[PDB]
Design a protein around this ligand. Sequence first.
Ligand code: TCH
Ligand code: TCH
Lengths: 202, 202
Amino acid sequence: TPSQKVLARQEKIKAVALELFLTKGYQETSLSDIIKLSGGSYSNIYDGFKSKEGLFFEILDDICKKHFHLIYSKTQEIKNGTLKEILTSFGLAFIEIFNQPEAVAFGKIIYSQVYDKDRHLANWIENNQQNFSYNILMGFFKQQNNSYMKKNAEKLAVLFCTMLKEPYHHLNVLINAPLKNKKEQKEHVEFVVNVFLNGINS
Amino acid sequence: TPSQKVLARQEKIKAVALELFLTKGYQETSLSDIIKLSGGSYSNIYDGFKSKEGLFFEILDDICKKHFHLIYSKTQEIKNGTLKEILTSFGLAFIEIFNQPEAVAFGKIIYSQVYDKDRHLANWIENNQQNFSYNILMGFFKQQNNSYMKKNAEKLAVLFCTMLKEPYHHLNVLINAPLKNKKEQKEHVEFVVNVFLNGINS
Ligand SMILES: C[C@H](CCC(=O)NCCS(=O)(=O)O)[C@@H]1CC[C@H]2[C@@H]3[C@H](O)C[C@H]4C[C@@H](O)CC[C@]4(C)[C@@H]3C[C@H](O)[C@@]21C
Ligand SMILES: C[C@H](CCC(=O)NCCS(=O)(=O)O)[C@@H]1CC[C@H]2[C@@H]3[C@H](O)C[C@H]4C[C@@H](O)CC[C@]4(C)[C@@H]3C[C@H](O)[C@@]21C
């Protein structure tokens, strides 16, 4: 099928681009390095494949879509459940993803673009709110029979994720601080879930 | 006094450097731009004034020292106090500092150094743990008559600060998201302080 070939070719460009971002470095890689190694399976084409920043965000689309499915699947896998169980189940999956060398490597790429005068990153964040894992949590909060949880669902979602994820990821990205092993992951999830539900007057 | 003149000259270099970082840009400013405009009140000298990254961290030293005094002063100003009052008093001051155009501008500088092969930033973070506002909070926790608060004092300090500060600062830095006005600051502090002390089962 024509359509299959197109998509398969788009997958070749992204794969070349990722390998170059990892071996050669994001900053020293130019569009042309990517077109070159893509061969005559590119020659000046049409999508967000018009700059290396565009390719980079086409890759994140994929990864975000991959993490969302992963985290949704693990949550709905309960038949239950107490908010307690739902929060920790989400905890575990979310935290696990941020403790992969991959999450740090892309983190470094995002932070280096802080001076980008084309706002590719702002466009991307503004056009993908729907695709972040925060929405899954935001989804469970509304359903709970509660005035507060329903009214503040987006904020509690965002807060719980942040407590789980910062300042660790930040330090991972800037100074290469070590990741958590799985025991530390688990430990830190129960910690955060306790304070979130019951607070430090327990 | 010789010593006064030395210090006054060190203050001229930092001031030139900050003005160049703000007008010209951190990345396009080189050491030499700073030596030049410093005049023959520099000529190849000795401290952390041997690179522009060093000057930059000599400035942050000052700012961090300035914010610490500011936040300590506001906390001890109680004669009380319930953990509730102490947390919010700290909240207000901490959050107020992160909602200044200055906190964003330096944020952008730090994030752009993500690929620095000299680890100036890691050295600086590793050699200044004692100078962060987190310690003030960590200090009050130990004193509370409690097993948990005392055992986990550094972690609760770090958690409470993060809940206050992320993901807002991050979005401020990367995509230029808007700051909070004072009502939003206050609102968000009481919000965070409630969840921190009492959790979402209130
Ligand atoms: C957008 C994230 C924070 C935004 C957020 O949490 N939502 C707030 C939205 S709003 O207030 O309601 O407007 C920030 C920017 C985009 C995210 C990055 C990208 O989403 C890419 C992800 C890929 C992940 O699987 C690994 C972390 C990561 C490499 C990033 C970590 C962190 O979640 C980021 C860097
Ligand atoms: C170091 C901060 C986070 C580290 C932290 O909170 N402590 C954890 C230490 S550890 O787990 O116990 O090892 C990160 C890096 C250094 C901090 C930056 C610098 O401290 C400079 C400050 C200046 C502030 O007044 C404005 C924000 C800011 C421009 C920064 C915001 C944020 O607090 C930063 C960027």
